[model samples]
Target chain A: MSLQVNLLNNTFANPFMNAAGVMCTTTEELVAMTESASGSLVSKSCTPALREGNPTPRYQALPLGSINSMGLPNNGFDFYLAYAAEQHDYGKKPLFLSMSGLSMRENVEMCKRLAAVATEKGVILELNLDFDAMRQCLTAVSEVYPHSFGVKMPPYFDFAHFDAAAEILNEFPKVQFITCINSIGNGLVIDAETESVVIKPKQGFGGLGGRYVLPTALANINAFYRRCPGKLIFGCGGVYTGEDAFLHVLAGASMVQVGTALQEEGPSIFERLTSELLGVMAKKRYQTLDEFRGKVRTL
Target chain B: MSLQVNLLNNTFANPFMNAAGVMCTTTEELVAMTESASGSLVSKSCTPALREGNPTPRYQALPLGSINSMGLPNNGFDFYLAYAAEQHDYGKKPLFLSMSGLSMRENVEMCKRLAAVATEKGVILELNLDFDAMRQCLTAVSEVYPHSFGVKMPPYFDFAHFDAAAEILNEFPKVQFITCINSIGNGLVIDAETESVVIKPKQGFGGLGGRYVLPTALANINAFYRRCPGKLIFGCGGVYTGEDAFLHVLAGASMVQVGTALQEEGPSIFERLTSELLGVMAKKRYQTLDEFRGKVRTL
Candidate 1:
């Protein structure tokens, strides 16, 4: 009865981790996540320079989920790199460095430097790619990094889209892992009393997370799991409880990342989630995570 | 103070409608919808030939929502056409005929005939198109129909996607109405106890609807509403209550559709939804639906 799972030739004590852009934005936050029961921690998506991000009321925690247009606020790539450099000790747990560059040049430069540093430090890089930019970014990163890195992908709704994205990701064997779903981006949540958008960014438009995206998140995770056979999948979205984690693993996620729920509950959630997941496993009469991981049944 | 909405040179008493592929699958169901309090109704999406749809156990009513792979089960386009011709009366309410053909040729033919009949009968047509099929289908349908009709769209996740879809939809002025979001497709739900897919169709891959898709639905509705002005937006997905419907209207949906919730709750739910929505309106001090329609404010 263990929650241990293996990815990229490495083993994690558990399959729970904080999603990028949640509590991982600061060094203290990252340290907190590492100190918690999470198997791994990812940094906030950083640009080349520090950014203040969007205005106030940029995020709203709703009953079912959450909405945010943070606009990529972070302490910058160099800050995250320094933290990763100082803290990464692969023997304790894995550390994932999340990068989202505003331009292709910045992305290439960030990957190039990260590639050189990662080889010595043993840090995992997670590249966030827009669908259109995937091929260009993957090609550039594979040329320089050429290691078992992963891509954090947006949810794709159509079969043709899933096929197209999987084909491109499959083309890069070094792209060994896939993170299915960022937030279902650019959603509007209204406050009927104010008759206005909930978040202040982009005229009240923000990315949607939490239970609102659970089904789509699972669809993308399972879609890639089935389509890209050799690649491991990290499921993100709509996970708050052990049941959500269990459901994600059942749909083929090697690991599950918590976002909105984690933001609301804090790092202690990892411990609770781990226990809850184990309880589910126990109830299902399962001894290990492998028993159900990627084994979702079809009638 | 009225909930009335004007579309296609007619007025809807309210903005509640059933999503295609819900209760309007049969003549009896259609009659029931007409007899109920819903503002409008749409037929089950019909293909060229009668489809018994997928095998039984194809639909499961979950606590949160519903899942189905009815595989387009219907009595065919002719049956729905006959019903539309026999029963449609504009003065009472509007009837939308939904068509989803297996092939492009079948789609074009369906539109050609539907256009001819719609001219005399005032039946509105709603063509369901995937992202890839939009340009080709819209081109063909607009050429044949040459009048205001609607397209039922799948939810999109990205801003660029919304821009692209809006651009294409805006191209054909005759595509005057857009139904934002069909079910998020190809989700697999497992019954852990049975260790099997819940639905018996397509080997357990089915479209997802209900609370799962509310945010994404609202996003699409608002995105298109903001992008493609002059095109009316009909919101679908995640609508179970009057609050849900009110939220949709606030986010730019001229009308809202109920899917899994409607199926589970039955036609009486329409009356309840209307009352609930009105209550929300009163609470918000909204005098008319237009006061908040598409008026979601940003801080």
Candidate 2:
């Protein structure tokens, strides 16, 4: 038997989320992996308009890690809508639509469009709030389709930011779940001799991830959990092994996002992690996730 | 009189360098650009032997940057030596060879090979001390061609790590200069929908650079200068414009290496940066590179 949990109106085989902006180069790739992995598929960050993204040499391989500045290049929401909705079989995977807009007006308009698209496809919307415009737009969108929507925020934001954002959504309790942290700030690496940054196309610092970001991500989740107590917290950033996932859970994450680790390890990581986690669970005699949520703080 | 002061080594024809790690899906693309760019050329990180490298999707694009897991994929030093000596026009631009080895013996052997090739071609070698093996090899190579060679280190290392390495070269003070802050840790982004980490071949974090890494790099260079004192310093990271180049100088760097900016702004960035830097010098009434070195530091 596998661990299962209920999130809002739906049931998840486990408490794990593939946070948006993680990875999925194409819709076909997402569709192919829907069966054995992921409770829900959150599309890559989709904007109102098409973006060519940054320049070339966009990616660079460092010693034990890698950094990228893809510059939010995506096909825009219209393409995502058409592409996502046509799926005939999602298997057990829930599709969480991610839409980002630059302005509140833009966000509202996009959400309205997304709500229409979701209704047409009978899918859930995981709206990503990028700016103040999004904070404002979510109010109206949640009022319209509360249960069908969820909001995600970057992890580095302080408690005050979370409380302020939460105050707006408190009335719409149906909009419950939150994904903590996107790759923090964009970063860069300059080659010593050539005086050139590694990645070519999208120049500049992109996002920070991998092992270095885990502590910051967990701290953000802990802080957010304190402010929005009882709300479902999904932790993202540097969850490589089962131990890492367990640590995130102990820190109060109901679910851990696995992106970098998965890239480093592969699909097999989930199986390996789950096996190790289960072994730990047997040793600790822990019956469920709730038994240890935020337990690290107590220690 | 023009206020712009070029470094006396005639190295200042322009503040441009060929960033390391050029992968030609085909050899023609690789050879063509080496001869084309206006700056000095650095061949991709060549190893002791030819490698097929990791697998495809080796490159992933992010919103502001990208990630690559090319794993020093190259046609061994033997191939590069033959290519560097024969294929491209050496007189057009200075060529600095990049070599990596897993052990000191391998590194020294590579250095001996490189030293032999340099004797024939008269091209300078920029030794990349990628692993511990390079330590002993550095001493051996330095002893052989003290004034003609330069040793480069990853930027992430502090003065302490370099001190040991630097001390070895101090006896052979003719080893020219030092470079630093190679790639930072690995990073990965996930696809929220697939619950899959985007996979790049060789799977894991790699060097990190781009605009995001500027401050850290500047600090590393500043730290190196403070510790090493008179040692030649190559300031690298987040150098997107002339002002950025100026900042590198102010932070105690004799020369600035730029990468991400080139990817963002294109090769013309070099020409633009040189012109803009001259404007800053003219306004500041500075006549030489030394006029403003390390002038801006709070500490």
Candidate 3:
């Protein structure tokens, strides 16, 4: 009857969390998420230095989803690391540090720093790595950090890619978590009235999120869940309601991250989602998420 | 005043085409597409040998989109090649041959055979290539064919990825066209009622199509359109209406492909799409597609 999730050797009160880059960019926002009823909170993806990010009109919400070219805008590593260093009651909720280095060197250096502080702070690190460079990135991080960290991955459309990525991830047993999908990248939205691109960055190119990416989000979660059995998955993309959250768990995600929908509905969404998921579970006569987690049937 | 598009030294009567995997699997289906209002038709992605594809219940339609793991089910290279070789008046509609080889060798061999017949048959070849292997595949195909062909690309999220992919694709001038996205691949859909995977193949892993991929589709099309000015882009994903078609063209796709919606609505959907597109254009006082094609505004 409870909505507890066991991940990274810690127990979560619930499986709901905010996806990186939604409302996690600032300390105030992170504090708000901590105060909210969500089970966990993640920081905005951090860079080596403070980034001004892209120009105005970087994010736009649509009826179905959202598009943005935030261009990895964030407070510097020091800023997020300082926030990570702050004292929070870990027993209340877990905190994840999301990092996206501009380059491999930066990533390694930042992870080195984060690793030094991670043991003391009980923070989980999530590295955003491309499929091609996962092996090298993991090797570098594992060598310097020597702690279990997770990866936030872009979706892979090919089975061969799934096999290859899983193989690399499996090789590094220290990689404990996998967050599937980081906005189907480089989508462009145009305003027909202005006959122009919606976002002001990269000449109107940006990442896509929201309902438009539900199937893809589920696909990546399930693909990795099937391919990398040893790893836990945190599903991101296209989550809005309790059904969306329930679907992610069914697809093998230990936790579900809300992005566009969070932006639309705000932190109160966590309460609604928790109730919705419980309602779904109750209707199905399920007592816990584990009862049906990763149990999607095939005919 | 016309929706005609010129590519590969040939003119398409309109920008509408069926995505390779949909409605082009059988000779009968190809013939049906030929007779439909679509301006161009592509054969289902063919492998070297016949593939029965994934198991039954492999495809399902949802209110938002559709999912399928057909696993490249096709009549094989010879079957599609024979159809391509058959004399069909080029002026009536252009025919594109879609190929997704099991390996690099298979791809080269198929392209070699396709190249030899391409000149006489005027069949446009669209090679479904992953970003990692695009350079090698393009090189092998160009050496053997020495003619303009297209590539079917999966969606890419990173700007760095776009830069790298475009760099490789731009190096091969003979790679005349680029199809942005090949179903956001390997998505898992669940039947809530049955608590089971919707598709039977790959343990319910399937390609996601229709509205789920609209933003990603537009992004890829526009990203390549910006990076590879020398090449044309064919937008495939999430086109169920004229507005969707208009969005693709506006986002820089010279042509747009329909998939799940096509499967649900049938070939007649093309006629409706054409009218819808014209209606959208007329509402915006657009005399021709070029007036807005690739002209998405940014503020």
Say which candidate scores most in TM-score: 1
Best prediction by DockQ: 3
Interface C-alpha root-mean-square deviation of candidate 1: 1.9
**What tens digits encode model 3's per-residue C-alpha lDDT throughout B152-202?**
987787678788999999999888889998877777787666888888878
RMSD of each: 2.0, 18.4, 2.9
Runs with alpha carbons beyond 4 Å of true place in candidate 2: A61-65, A116-122, A130-134, A143-146, A157-174, A192-195, A201-203, A264-268, B1-299
C-alpha TM-score for every candidate: 0.95, 0.50, 0.91
User: Please, what are the lDDT tens digits per residue for candidate 2 over residues B251-297?
Assistant: 66666666555545555565677777777777667666677676652
Computed on C-alpha atoms, the DockQ of candidate 1 is 0.64
Task: Sort the candidates on DockQ, descending order.
Answer: 3, 1, 2
| DockQ-best of 2 and 3 | 3
lDDT of 3 by residue, A1-299 (tens): 98999878788989999999899988779888988889898999999999989888899998889988888889999998988887555767989999999888898899889986789878899887755577887888888886899999987777888888998999988889999989777777776667777888777777789988887788889889988998999999888988888889988999999999999988999999999999999999999999999998867
lDDT of 2 at A218: 64
How do the residues A1-299 of candidate 1 rate in per-residue lDDT, one tens digit apiece? 89998887778999998999999998789889888899898999989899999888899999879999998999999998888777656667888999999987888888877876687777888888745677987887788775689999988866878899999999999988899889877877776567777887777778889987777787788889999999999999999999888888888899899999999999999999999998988999998888988888876
Looking at model 3, give its docking quality level: medium
TM-score of the second chain for every model: 0.96, 0.79, 0.97
Q: Is candidate 1 or candidate 2 better by DockQ?
A: 1
lDDT of 1 by residue, B1-299 (tens): 67788888778999998999899988889988887789999999999889988888888887667777788899899998888887766667888999999887888888777876787777899888855677988888778775689999987877888999999998999988899989877766766566667888766767788877777788899999989997999999889888889889878899899999999988899999989988888887877888878877657
